[PDB]
Design a protein around this ligand. Structure first.
Ligand code: K
Ligand code: K
Ligand code: MN
Ligand code: MN
Lengths: 134, 134
């Protein structure tokens, strides 16, 4: 019955800082803003920012949100965010270029070259420990 | 230059339980499973489940992940998951039918009828406090 992802909503403590991050560094389009949140769009992704002034960010675990990027744009993106002072949380190890960075609250983000099909094809050629396919 | 959402990765304490939930209850297709994770697909959404020992779930905030559903399927989906004993975390108040439910770790999920455009149109008629559009 479900059709795919409809929207992603992130708690944010500092709404102005988060809008500026997602709009200006990550290139989201700001579609609406109000006293307690904002709606942005990137491709078909609907992002909601929900203002929660006491929010401290997530604890340390592997939950994260990956955005796509083309191969030819990857190096420039990584270099741009590095030059802006963005903090990284992981060095890439899996198939396809990836840049693993934190948002202003500490949500874990990724910019990734590739998709599920390229991952599965790389895994078929070199399956992970215990790996089995559909 | 980012293209949209590439994948969503969730930390899970009980990888078997989480696969069963997303595959068998929510209808994701299991594409690959290994000792420390799984890859599933729903429409264009690539979901990765990452095994995380002793993970206790997120703390309480509004961060959540919404999946789309057709209007004609909404009521039967909500009824199905209620019958299966899924726990709800919010009663719908915003435009478009929504069912707000927890996964086995306590990740906050939503099944939603509507999209960003239907939301913006409704908000222009009944705006949130301080709302601005662009
Ligand atoms: K990677
Ligand atoms: K709603
Ligand atoms: Mn990832
Ligand atoms: Mn929502």
């Amino acid at each position: 019955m479900l059709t795919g992802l409809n929207h992603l909503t992130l708690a944010v403590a500092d709404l102005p800082a988060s809008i500026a991050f997602y709009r200006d560094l990550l290139g989201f389009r700001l579609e609406a803003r109000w006293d307690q949140g904002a709606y942005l769009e990137l491709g078909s992704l609907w992002l909601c920012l929900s203002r929660e002034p006491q929010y401290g960010g997530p604890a340390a675990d592997y939950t994260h949100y990956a955005f796509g990027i083309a191969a030819a744009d990857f190096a420039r993106f990584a270099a741009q965010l590095r030059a802006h002072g963005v903090r990284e949380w992981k060095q890439n190890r899996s198939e396809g270029d990836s840049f693993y960075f934190l948002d202003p609250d500490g949500h874990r983000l990724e910019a990734h070259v590739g998709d599920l099909r390229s991952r599965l094809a790389a895994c078929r050629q070199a399956p992970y420990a215990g790996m089995r396919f559909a």
